[PDB]
Amino acid sequence: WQENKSWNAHFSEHKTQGVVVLWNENTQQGFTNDLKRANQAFLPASTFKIPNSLIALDLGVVKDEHQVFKWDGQTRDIAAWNRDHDLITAMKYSVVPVYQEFARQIGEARMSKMLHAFDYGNEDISGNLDSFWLDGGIRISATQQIAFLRKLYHNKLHVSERSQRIVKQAMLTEANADYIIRAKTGYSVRIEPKIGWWVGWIELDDNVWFFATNMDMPTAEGLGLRQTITKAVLKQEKIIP
Amino acid sequence: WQENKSWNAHFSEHKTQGVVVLWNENTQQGFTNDLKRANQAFLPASTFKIPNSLIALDLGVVKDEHQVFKWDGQTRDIAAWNRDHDLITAMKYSVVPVYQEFARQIGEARMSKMLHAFDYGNEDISGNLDSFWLDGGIRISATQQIAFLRKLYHNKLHVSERSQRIVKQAMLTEANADYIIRAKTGYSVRIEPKIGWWVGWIELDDNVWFFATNMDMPTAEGLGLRQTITKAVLKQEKIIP
Ligand SMILES: [Cl-]
């Protein structure tokens, strides 16, 4: 691994602190601004919708990316959540209640078994079955997110190939003539320290760069920095124009 | 079907002529600027890379989207062709020689059978096996492109679900927070009349709009118009911002 303490400027410039981790697939070399925070584990929050989606698809809890999950009629604080969703829009708008019902149907035994097979973080689901990724005992670091994401990219996780392709479709975030981004955001607010996440990868013509970013997030006002800081580093390193 | 002549403004501004065809999947209604040209058949040229990809994958000529197809060492006029490619970059850069080798390995009997199964245009492959979509007997209209693409979107073509998801991945062209475009360009120059194509669809949160465009292309100078004129119509109908 390679440490560049100069990169810390991107976080301090915004009066916060955090970590960016990059991985070059062709050369098999990793880069970060801070090796210790790169290996520090946090609640995954909505980045857990990647493994949760995979498990639900493989077990038949979700039939495909078109199946409609009806609003239960309870008015919640996020307007985007108070409507019907399929897998694509539930990912895009990070619809917590849809995923809470997934976890209930998967069950404790099958959830635990899958995460052990995935080698996902500390593999620990202690807490409520329907909120453990929000205020329970599961933890994962930026470097661990990278390792998990590399297996998904190569279809190496122990679920069907079909499941892995459908989730990668649902992760699609941005695309143009120069690159494709597949990724997922997160915001952990229930337990200190509050942090924001962005994890995923960038597909180029002849290479792939994996990334995992997190940063302290005392208020929701700074959530855009999740993407902004990551893109600033990528542009800096000439990965994107 | 419904005719909207106001769209002609977008063509005449550039002193050229053509057709745009749109299909609203939610309501099952079609729209076009020229009912007559919408049904006129042309060579598919590089839009034929969609069915050619599906067939190559389903028969194992292509193992997956990562398999590398080596350059044959002949320097052709388009520099981007003179190098190694996989399925994703061969679609992106319209690499004719890679697909000419696909066709040779598929063979006449299996190609023909697949096109009958797909209801693809006039289903006629007469000519050279390695160039019939460029200067042989196959023909397809803008309206027939729509029908074929609808089958693909719904995984209804007579190949595996997997083959269909991989080609849809390879068609990925643009994506942002407002929409996703999966499509393929074409440029028919060997046989008159010279034309340009852009065929595919736009994915929204709650609907999908299919599109098929062609226009006269006496010179390469106007190739950028395939996308800009299509985009102009979409903007007018408030489908994209
Ligand atoms: Cl995709």
Numbering used by the authors:
A (entry chain A), B (entry chain B): 25 to 265
Text from the published report:
We solved the crystal structure of OXA-436 to high resolution (1.80 Å) with good overall geometry. Paired refinement, as outlined by Diederichs & Karplus and implemented in the Phenix suite, confirms that the highest resolution shell still contains useful data for refinement with the least-squares target. Chloride ions are observed bridging the dimer interfaces, stabilized by the guanidine group of Arg206 from each chain of the dimers, as has previously been shown for OXA-48, in contrast to the cation-mediated dimerization observed for OXA-10 and OXA-14. In the α3–α4 loop there are two differences: Ala104 in OXA-436 corresponds to Thr104 in OXA-48, and Asp110 in OXA-436 is Asn110 in OXA-48. In the β5–β6 loop, there is only a difference between Val213 in OXA-436 and Thr213 in OXA-48. In OXA-436, a hydrophobic environment with Val213 and Val120 surrounds the R 1 phenyl ring of ampicillin. From the crystal structure of OXA-436 determined to 1.80 Å resolution, we have used molecular dynamics to explore the differences in substrate hydrolysis, with a particular focus on the α3–α4 loop and the β5–β6 loop as tuneable elements for the substrate selectivity of the OXA-48-like group of enzymes.
With a sequence identity of 91.3% to OXA-48, we expected OXA-436 to have similar characteristics to other OXA-48-like enzymes. The carbapenem-hydrolyzing class D β-lactamase OXA-436 has been characterized as a mesophilic variant of OXA-48, with an observed average thermal stability of 53.8°C and an increased response to changes in temperature when compared with OXA-48.
